[PDB]
Amino acid sequence: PPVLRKCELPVPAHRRPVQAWIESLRGYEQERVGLTELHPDVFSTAPRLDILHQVAIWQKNFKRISYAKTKTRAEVRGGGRKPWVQKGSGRARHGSIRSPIWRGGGVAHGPRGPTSYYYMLPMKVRVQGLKVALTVKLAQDDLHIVDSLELPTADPQYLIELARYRRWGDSVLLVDLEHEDMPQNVVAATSGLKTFNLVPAVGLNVHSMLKHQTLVLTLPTVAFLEEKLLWHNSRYTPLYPFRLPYCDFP
Amino acid sequence: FHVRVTLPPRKVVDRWNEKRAMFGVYDNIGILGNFEKHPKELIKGPIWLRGWKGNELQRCIRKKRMVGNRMFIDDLHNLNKRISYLYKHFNRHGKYR
Amino acid sequence: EYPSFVESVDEYHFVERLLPPASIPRPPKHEHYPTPSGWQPPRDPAPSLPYFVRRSRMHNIPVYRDITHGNRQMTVIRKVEGDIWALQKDVEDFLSPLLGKTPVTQVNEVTGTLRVKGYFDQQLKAWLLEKGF
Amino acid sequence: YRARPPPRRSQEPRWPDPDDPLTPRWQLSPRYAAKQFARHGAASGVAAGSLWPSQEQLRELEAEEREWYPSLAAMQESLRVQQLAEE
Amino acid sequence: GPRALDLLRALPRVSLANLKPNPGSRKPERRPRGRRRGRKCGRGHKGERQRGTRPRLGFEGGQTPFYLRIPKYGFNEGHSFRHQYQPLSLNRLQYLIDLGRVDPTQPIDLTQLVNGRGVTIQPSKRDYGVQLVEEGADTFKAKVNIEVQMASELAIAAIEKNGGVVTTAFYDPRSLEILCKPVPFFLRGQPIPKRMLPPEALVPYYTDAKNRGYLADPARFPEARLELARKYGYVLPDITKDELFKMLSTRKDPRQIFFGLAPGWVVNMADKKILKPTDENLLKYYSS
Amino acid sequence: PLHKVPVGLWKQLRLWEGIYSRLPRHYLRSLEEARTPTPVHYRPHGAKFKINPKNWQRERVEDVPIPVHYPPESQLGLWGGEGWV
Amino acid sequence: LVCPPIQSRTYIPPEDLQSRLESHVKEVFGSSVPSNWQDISLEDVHLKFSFLARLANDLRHAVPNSRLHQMCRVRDVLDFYNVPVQDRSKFDELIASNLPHNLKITWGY
Numbered sequence A: 001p002p003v004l005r006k007c008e009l010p011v012p013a014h015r016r017p018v019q020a021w022i023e024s025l026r027g028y029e030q031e032r033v034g035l036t037e038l039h040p041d042v043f044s045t046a047p048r049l050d051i052l053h054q055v056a057i058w059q060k061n062f063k064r065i066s067y068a069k070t071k072t073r074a075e076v077r078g079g080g081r082k083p084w085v086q087k088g089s090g091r092a093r094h095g096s097i098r099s100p101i102w103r104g105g106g107v108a109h110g111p112r113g114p115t116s117y118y119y120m121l122p123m124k125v126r127v128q129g130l131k132v133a134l135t136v137k138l139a140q141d142d143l144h145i146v147d148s149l150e151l152p153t154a155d156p157q158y159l160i161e162l163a164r165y166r167r168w169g170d171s172v173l174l175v176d177l178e179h180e181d182m183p184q185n186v187v188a189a190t191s192g193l194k195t196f197n198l199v200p201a202v203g204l205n206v207h208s209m210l211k212h213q214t215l216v217l218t219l220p221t222v223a224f225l226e227e228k229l230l231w232h233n234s235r236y237t238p239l240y241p242f243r244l245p246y247c248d249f250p
Numbered sequence B: 001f002h003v004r005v006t007l008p009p010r011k012v013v014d015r016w017n018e019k020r021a022m023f024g025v026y027d028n029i030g031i032l033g034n035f036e037k038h039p040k041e042l043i044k045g046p047i048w049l050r051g052w053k054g055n056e057l058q059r060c061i062r063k064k065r066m067v068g069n070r071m072f073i074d075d076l077h078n079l080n081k082r083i084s085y086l087y088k089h090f091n092r093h094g095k096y097r
Numbered sequence C: 001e002y003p004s005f006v007e008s009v010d011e012y013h014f015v016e017r018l019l020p021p022a023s024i025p026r027p028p029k030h031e032h033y034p035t036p037s038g039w040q041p042p043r044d045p046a047p048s049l050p051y052f053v054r055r056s057r058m059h060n061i062p063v064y065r066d067i068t069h070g071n072r073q074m075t076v077i078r079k080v081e082g083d084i085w086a087l088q089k090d091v092e093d094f095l096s097p098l099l100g101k102t103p104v105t106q107v108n109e110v111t112g113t114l115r116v117k118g119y120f121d122q123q124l125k126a127w128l129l130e131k132g133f
Numbered sequence D: 001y002r003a004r005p006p007p008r009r010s011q012e013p014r015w016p017d018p019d020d021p022l023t024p025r026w027q028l029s030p031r032y033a034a035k036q037f038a039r040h041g042a043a044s045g046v047a048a049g050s051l052w053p054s055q056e057q058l059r060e061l062e063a064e065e066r067e068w069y070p071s072l073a074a075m076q077e078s079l080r081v082q083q084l085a086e087e
Numbered sequence E: 001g002p003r004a005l006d007l008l009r010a011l012p013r014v015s016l017a018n019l020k021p022n023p024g025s026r027k028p029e030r031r032p033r034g035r036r037r038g039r040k041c042g043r044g045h046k047g048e049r050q051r052g053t054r055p056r057l058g059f060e061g062g063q064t065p066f067y068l069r070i071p072k073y074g075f076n077e078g079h080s081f082r083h084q085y086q087p088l089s090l091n092r093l094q095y096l097i098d099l100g101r102v103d104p105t106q107p108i109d110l111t112q113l114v115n116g117r118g119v120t121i122q123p124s125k126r127d128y129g130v131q132l133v134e135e136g137a138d139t140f141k142a143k144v145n146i147e148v149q150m151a152s153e154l155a156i157a158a159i160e161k162n163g164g165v166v167t168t169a170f171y172d173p174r175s176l177e178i179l180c181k182p183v184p185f186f187l188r189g190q191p192i193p194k195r196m197l198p199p200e201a202l203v204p205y206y207t208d209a210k211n212r213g214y215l216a217d218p219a220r221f222p223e224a225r226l227e228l229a230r231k232y233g234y235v236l237p238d239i240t241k242d243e244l245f246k247m248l249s250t251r252k253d254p255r256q257i258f259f260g261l262a263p264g265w266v267v268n269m270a271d272k273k274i275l276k277p278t279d280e281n282l283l284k285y286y287s288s
Numbered sequence F: 001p002l003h004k005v006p007v008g009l010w011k012q013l014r015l016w017e018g019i020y021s022r023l024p025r026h027y028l029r030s031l032e033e034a035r036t037p038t039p040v041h042y043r044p045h046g047a048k049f050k051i052n053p054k055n056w057q058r059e060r061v062e063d064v065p066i067p068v069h070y071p072p073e074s075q076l077g078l079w080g081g082e083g084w085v
Numbered sequence G: 001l002v003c004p005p006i007q008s009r010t011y012i013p014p015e016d017l018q019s020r021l022e023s024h025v026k027e028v029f030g031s032s033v034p035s036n037w038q039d040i041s042l043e044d045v046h047l048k049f050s051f052l053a054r055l056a057n058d059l060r061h062a063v064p065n066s067r068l069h070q071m072c073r074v075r076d077v078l079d080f081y082n083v084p085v086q087d088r089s090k091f092d093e094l095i096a097s098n099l100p101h102n103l104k105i106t107w108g109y
């Protein structure tokens, strides 16, 4: 019984959907189980490596808080009096003995307290980065669509053999639709592996997509990503945050 | 300029530990999650620096306003002196004016 | 001392009008084109040219004007998919008789942008409408 | 590995402990209760009659309105007198 | 189309090890290190400039400053109390109607314009709503029940030519914020307040039939419409016998903010319900 | 580090913990309540809103009590609520 | 659950490729053969999937995921299958590309 997936959103007349194979995780040899169509505006956009770099740097940086702090000359313990008189001593003139010139003196500039390197990229830019990551993953033959993400056994060695037989790559990232709906077999199989990482649909990002050589998507995950990413191409600006009720948005 | 005469122990750093494998996994929690949570809520750190960024004077002002009622005596004194020094330097010193 | 209140649902249909849409509605179909505002929808079949100028999210032509340094005037054609070199050739051929010389153009292939030196926004909008984009 | 459960915003109403001295006052002000009722209504557990002003609040509001909002007839009469004086 | 996708097949894997920003996107920072950027580090020789003790901006070295020798004159005097009205061209209104942002089949309100993103109102910046201008009156071919705060005489004439209804109403800042953003107000959990009357400076504007004021005498509306039609040389449409006469003649009470809703009601959007007060004092206060 | 409880609440926590908690409830609430003393050395204004003479606009206006110093010998007599300004 | 040996992914187009394509087109479409059987579109998703899967099983070579949108007609499929695919790398090619006598290369991995 072939499994066939059609695009659920209006495709522009000037672009045709891109076709992809639908594999299965049950058997080693069964690598052609179905056929799916993917929107060109998600899996076939133009590859923007600059946008990919922007999104990857943003992901690496916005969460960073550097807990580095050094005491200035005003925070070092002593140094409250002139060590010697200004004139007559014949040596250099100094004020506090905690000046940056001195041995145990404070740092001139240094790092000052916890510093937050937090900035937020525009939402359309982030969505375009996700789209470009998916597009390059599909173009470089590093994206594989499976169905229901089910496994026969909970042995991580089974996944290792399957990956090395299918030549997926050293690193595999399996994405499922929902966290609580992931089958226990694949959950236990991937709980004991380092290069095989299993994440929900909401946990997909450019950094992990680039970190892992191979991306594995289920059909519901593909539909979810398609619907979530194609919404920003024909949307108004938010009068108030979208968490608030709208006419056509949850 | 004397440099060490022995090989340092080569750090066996792995790129596939839990933190490196799940780094920033939910960075798109909002975009892919029918907005309820901003990526601000994933930032762990000081209370006065979650989802905010500023220069040293603004950071000191925000820290004093937010957690200044729980600071120690010398810490609060140092913060006040740093605020005063930064105010004077930023509003009275420099080249470009 | 809480005052008594009446719980009703009949009047709640007025609250539906007060909910703004999060998406941009598709333009209504008109019996005559162009519309009184000058808007005109794209042709049903795509042209055979080896490039496509995708419409804006508000269903407008992506031709804009840009100013730099206060005196550098430019025209930007965006959302170009296909042979942007062919689009540049067509634009320069169309604009040569108007200026008496080949217009100065810059092509951003990684982005898909044409940048002409000068304000030709309305002329290029009309040209793209006639060409069917 | 397996990813941690996603961070999800709970939809149930939240009520801070009023006996805690460390809880902020903005979470104990009546506006917080009104907003909780607006967000949830049934699950909030707030009596809907508290949203409207009480007797004393209504009296204060009416006094303020009478003092700082003249009636249309009075305002028109004042305008007429002003135009008459200017003429 | 996207030949870059086919080019990417020959290229190796795209990973974090090969990532480059756009050229010219990040100008490299320069530090006072080296022969060229050292030796006073771009500060100059002695004086106040190298030691960073320059005077303020307006200082001219002891001379009476330019920004202080000019006499004070009222230019921004009372700027924070002047009424502001965002302009809305008839051309822009026609563009919105043609693109479907606003439906002419329903009474057009400030809330509808904000939802359609045709105008942006900032009540904190002393905006008092939307005014109508005549910048596109020649090609305006729509019949709408417009509802603005100020209206130009030519814009009114243009709308009445096609057979619409122009009504100018007043909104105090609180009700204006509520109209602009009703959903945040409904999540605020407060009863709908009454609409404050215009001040004495704006009462003549809103009580005259020439401006189509919402507090004006309805008996003088046909006279003003006929005078307008005679002035601008067009026949006044038979609005009464129109199919959409109910939609054209729908009106808001001068103490009413929304359509259908009444002051004092609480809109519980979670349960999709409306709570109405029943106390005599509350009803008298809200209807007074 | 930072204190869990702000320094302002230290006195209230000390009153809540220990023998201070065994005091009668009416006494505890009588000391907890803080009524504003009647104006003595400053004249209060009536309305909460006033018209600015130079701006001709309505503005909110409030009462700021003037600090009064009560010398120790004021506790041995009845000064009527007034002291040293 | 035994692991089959991993294929070398080395594809050499056989002489009977045209006959195999014709037979598979017959077995998939099941209708009368037109005059130009190489110009039939693969628009039908079921037929395209069945044809591609049968070809992959027959020739031990499947179309890559990126080229599925390119595969539109039997002519395109024939063009795809007429080109060989080599798994050996540049070093492997240089080793077997008849190195001169004075050039010695030894693998150190």
Ligand SMILES: [Mg+2]
Pocket: A074, A078, A079, A080
């Ligand atoms: Mg010191």
Ligand SMILES: [Mg+2]
Pocket: A080, A081
């Ligand atoms: Mg000293």
Ligand SMILES: [Mg+2]
Pocket: A095, A096
């Ligand atoms: Mg000194």
Ligand SMILES: [Mg+2]
Pocket: A104
């Ligand atoms: Mg020491």
Ligand SMILES: [Mg+2]
Pocket: A104, A105, A106
């Ligand atoms: Mg030190």
Ligand SMILES: [Mg+2]
Pocket: C066, C067
């Ligand atoms: Mg610009």
Ligand SMILES: [Mg+2]
Pocket: E030
């Ligand atoms: Mg410099």
Ligand SMILES: [Mg+2]
Pocket: E029, E030, E031
């Ligand atoms: Mg620098």
Ligand SMILES: [Mg+2]
Pocket: E035, E036, E037, E038, E039, E040, E041, E042
């Ligand atoms: Mg130098």
Ligand SMILES: [Mg+2]
Pocket: E039
């Ligand atoms: Mg030197």
Ligand SMILES: [Mg+2]
Pocket: E045, E046, E047
């Ligand atoms: Mg000098």
Ligand SMILES: [Mg+2]
Pocket: none
């Ligand atoms: Mg010097």
Ligand SMILES: [Mg+2]
Pocket: E062
């Ligand atoms: Mg002088």
Ligand SMILES: [Mg+2]
Pocket: E086, E120, E121, E122, E127
């Ligand atoms: Mg504005």
